[PDB]
Amino acid sequence: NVDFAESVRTRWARRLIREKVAKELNILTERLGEVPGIPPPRGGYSHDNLPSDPLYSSIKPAEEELPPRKVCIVGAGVSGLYIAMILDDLKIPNLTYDIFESSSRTGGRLYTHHFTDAKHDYYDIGAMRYPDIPSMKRTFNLFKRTGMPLIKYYLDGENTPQLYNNHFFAKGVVDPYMVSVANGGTVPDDVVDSVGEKLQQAFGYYKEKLAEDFDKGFDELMLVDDMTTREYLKRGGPKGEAPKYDFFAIQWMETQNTGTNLFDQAFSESVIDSFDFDNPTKPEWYCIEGGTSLLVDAMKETLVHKVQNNKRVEAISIDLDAPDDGNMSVKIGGKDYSGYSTVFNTTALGCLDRMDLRGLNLHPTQADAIRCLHYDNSTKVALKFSYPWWIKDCGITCGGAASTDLPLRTCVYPSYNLGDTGEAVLLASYTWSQDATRIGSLVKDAPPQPPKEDELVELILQNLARLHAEHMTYEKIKEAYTGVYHAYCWANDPNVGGAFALFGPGQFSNLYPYLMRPAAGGKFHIVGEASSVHHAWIIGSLESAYTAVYQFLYKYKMWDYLRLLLERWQYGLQELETGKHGTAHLQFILGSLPK
Amino acid sequence: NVDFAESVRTRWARRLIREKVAKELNILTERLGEVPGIPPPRGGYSHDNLPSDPLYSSIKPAEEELPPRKVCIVGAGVSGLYIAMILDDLKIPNLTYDIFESSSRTGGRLYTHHFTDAKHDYYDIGAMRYPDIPSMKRTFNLFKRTGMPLIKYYLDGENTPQLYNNHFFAKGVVDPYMVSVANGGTVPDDVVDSVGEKLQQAFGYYKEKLAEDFDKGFDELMLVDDMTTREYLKRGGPKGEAPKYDFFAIQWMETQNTGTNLFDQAFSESVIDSFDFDNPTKPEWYCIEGGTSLLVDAMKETLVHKVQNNKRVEAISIDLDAPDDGNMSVKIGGKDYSGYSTVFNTTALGCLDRMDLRGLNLHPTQADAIRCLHYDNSTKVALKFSYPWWIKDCGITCGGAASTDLPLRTCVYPSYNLGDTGEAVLLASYTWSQDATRIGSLVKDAPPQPPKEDELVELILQNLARLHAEHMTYEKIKEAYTGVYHAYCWANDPNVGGAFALFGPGQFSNLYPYLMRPAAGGKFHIVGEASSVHHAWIIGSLESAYTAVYQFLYKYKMWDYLRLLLERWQYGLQELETGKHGTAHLQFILGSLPK
Ligand SMILES: Cc1cc2nc3c(=O)[nH]c(=O)nc-3n(C[C@H](O)[C@H](O)[C@H](O)COP(=O)(O)OP(=O)(O)OC[C@H]3O[C@@H](n4cnc5c(N)ncnc54)[C@H](O)[C@@H]3O)c2cc1C
Ligand SMILES: Cc1cc2nc3c(=O)[nH]c(=O)nc-3n(C[C@H](O)[C@H](O)[C@H](O)COP(=O)(O)OP(=O)(O)OC[C@H]3O[C@@H](n4cnc5c(N)ncnc54)[C@H](O)[C@@H]3O)c2cc1C
């Protein structure tokens, strides 16, 4: 048995599915009376009373029979590659696939940039760090399968500076930044040095409720599911007997919040997220020695069918006049590619919304889920210096990250070059949201002609000097700078359009059931991190792929290989609720309805 | 006398100033007891009881005496040019100025792109339309002063298509898009065809309160000042006895909302905004024949001192060790420019936050106001066709704008080429927020090499065909396309960083008093649309400039030219509350405090 803290996210997700399916089943039994796949008897359905799987008798463990089939994988990020890897391992007779990549590059949001092919001469533009928590079992299994060299990622370093209001942070000092009301600021005195615990308090109130009675706690959490984290703090709602915080208190919390947007996401999932690290929040973090793109390389090279880059799918369709399995097609550069029995789309939702999907006959609400989700921006700037001055001169010897209200916002000291004494890469700027958009405005796809330094480099070098002024001069940093740098803004990437999906108030609880269920007669799948309760991480991408493969096997009643899937590829807690009294078959049925 | 509807925005803004000043005065009288500029007597101060202007006896109407002074204007957008125009007209003896422009282009968010120098061969990337409402008096005066050729802007056209859920809009049809619950959708049946009135209802409830008792209404509006428009609709708060709307209802409202973001701004200013057009909302709209940049041209050419382009200010400072007037300086490309008695900064706040402002010794809360405000993204795509097929084939003969859930979102039919039969420009895509970021990801600063068509053009042409499918084929539009197009995304512009400031919940009421008040001993001014209650429009930019010039004249006690300013340059309702019992002098004093 897994303890409560590690089980709540999955229980939460599964309950959300049941809530939606029950309403849609009631509605359809009140819109058609009969539902294809069920035997309706006589509002009726509810979240803890849904029909059993009528096909379960075939799923109990207890050559060329399978007709030749071909599936299409849209996207060669980690989700698409994982689908292909699973399919390869299952070795389904006469089953083949095409995997199309829009970019010339494979990997998607797994993206290491190499300045040279020198050992440590890189930086990760996408995913870079991985926590050893139980929800990440599937991820670390993939690392094992592909033989990834894992090293320690230092989240908290030594002597990393913090700079706000042009004051450096100092331990055991009341309001070191001098921004509190007592020192002529507007930040409330009870908040300025206690941001972390006020937040933990707000979440802890609902974590405590869920702990002793989940359903009761779930019902209470639903009352704040329709509000942002900022809103909850600005109301203490919904009643609200919870502690209030004025405008400047919350603004200071947001200021101190570097990293992805939290205050504009649903408070309910902010609460769920605080369970993620309650084994507790001192697990070990890991990164891949040589860059995350080593995973991409290992995965794409073991594929039975090679990734086709520079193939941008612009339309997806199904021919319902044709009774055969392979009646689906995609359009690439004006050319039709047909004969597919299933299409897995693994792109970011913005990319999918850009396609012509009329041929799929998607229901408007599912089309909404694809269109309406926002993506959080992220930008990275990396600079090469002739020596690691932060290690040697500043005493920053074990990674970590600096924080400031300066434009660069965060400076990340690499965990993979701690012993180097020569040329060294620094992740000088790591930003999110509006900060990332601002730095991104300075990042141009066509770099300046050597050796001219543009506004971005000049801004970063100046910010770095002020941030490390306790040990470094601006002159010294400029001299140490080799003239080599690279930068990347994800919202400017047409193939992705942001770091990862942001779920606003009510968006996950209402749209996640739609993103997870099949379409086009159970032949179309929306795959990717955003389609999973484990979103914004690799695990979400990997779990979504596993889920979609399940529903694909279920669609064509390949019970032998469905069982094989459950034996070989089930890691951690399974997101999809399968079994006789599960909901996977109901999502399948709702996603396979005729027209 | 002006009627209530046209006075509420100014009364609202002036009251917000009084609320903040009263708190800061009480605080400072509880932090220092004495305040430089006042004679404190003995919590005490309140919004309707603030000290009179001790210098008013000099301001009542009732050669070279003025020492030589020089001021710096940062930014050659419409705000900076307007400052220069006012200064020129006042002809203050021995007063000169430098105006520095970061871009090679003058005009900022006034930006017409000319494909050729042909008569109608352009499109406006920034501001383009201007409503004849009383708040716009200052704007139309500027148009008159510069001799702008005004023509009719058609907001609502004829036969403009609307496309949602792949259904075209049709009058007198219940749920034409088929997205309501009754037709298997999730949009509530009472909302789907009545979005406009449900919104008007929500605002009308508070507009009604303000109408009969402003202060009482103001106090009630403050209770919803800390919530978004979406939040208010999702709560009916704050009590809340107001009508509720579920997730899909509000999502449909947002979907139908093309144009700038509204649902994430404060509900309080959403209410105030609904007064903007209550003379009512059928005023005439105007645009400038030949493009908005004609205004920029007229303004910059009449300037006594020519705009210096390619001059990016990277730092602003004041020398408090020096008792002389001109003790301020700016840094441009590593070079110091000194001798300034006042600096007017007119840049977008993101640009100002990018500067080194340590030499100004800004108070942390004012620095917050500069840093924390978000900007709404906007993107435009314009295409040239060999003939105006929308006029000739589609019957769209009087401008207007199409609306769709397709990627291009809105298609604007130009009001300045209605009679043309040959080559014609179409504003094929006009987007905001996340939509603008997505289209913007396809807009690259280095265009494709002729005559290759990139993903953006292909996407737009396909969307245009579906949008105008009632009269046009995709083939026909492709043939009509000349191969010439241009696109621009404002969040990608490092000199601006977005369309205009977005004021989230609580942000205007709390930060506007800081953005409006001087700094650095009353010698530094934050100027621009975001510094005004009339923000996101040209009037806000123009009113901010006028306000800053007032405080500049007041700082150096130039009463002769201060009076001249009030006689010649006072248009519409004055935002800044001046007079004996005003608050301008208190903002000045709070903004001139020593260190
Ligand atoms: C900056 C950043 C930091 C992160 N940090 C971490 C971290 O520390 N740890 C962690 O576990 N996760 C992290 N994440 C998230 C993680 O990287 C993602 O969840 C995951 O990589 C996404 O995988 P995916 O295959 O679902 O989507 P993607 O990687 O986006 O794959 C989609 C692919 O489809 C392609 N595509 C798009 N449009 C089309 C089209 N029309 N036709 C064909 N192909 C198309 C794209 O090019 C892309 O390659 C981070 C992400 C980012 C951006
Ligand atoms: C797409 C769009 C549509 C709009 N629609 C309308 C409309 O229909 N009607 C309407 O009235 N208004 C509209 N607005 C708003 C209006 O255009 C603006 O309010 C106004 O033009 C902004 O003027 P400004 O001088 O305050 O700022 P800006 O125009 O931004 O001027 C600031 C200047 O400072 C410069 N600068 C930046 N950084 C530096 C630096 N470090 N050193 C020196 N200079 C620097 C910039 O290049 C810029 O030129 C629209 C705006 C946009 C973007």
UniProtKB/TrEMBL annotation, chains A, B:
One of its GO terms (biological process) is amino acid catabolic process. InterPro entries: Amino_oxidase, FAD/NAD-bd_sf, Flavin_monoamine_oxidase. It comes from the Eukaryota. Coiled coil: none annotated. FAD binds at S79, E101, R109, M128, R129, V313, C351, E529, W537, I538, S541. Keywords: FAD, Flavoprotein, Nucleotide-binding. Residues 79-549 form the Amine oxidase domain. Transmembrane segments: none annotated. GO terms for molecular function: L-amino-acid oxidase activity; nucleotide binding. Gene3D superfamilies: 1.10.10.1620, 3.90.660.10, FAD/NAD(P)-binding domain. It holds the Pfam family Amino_oxidase. This is L-Lysine alpha-oxidase.
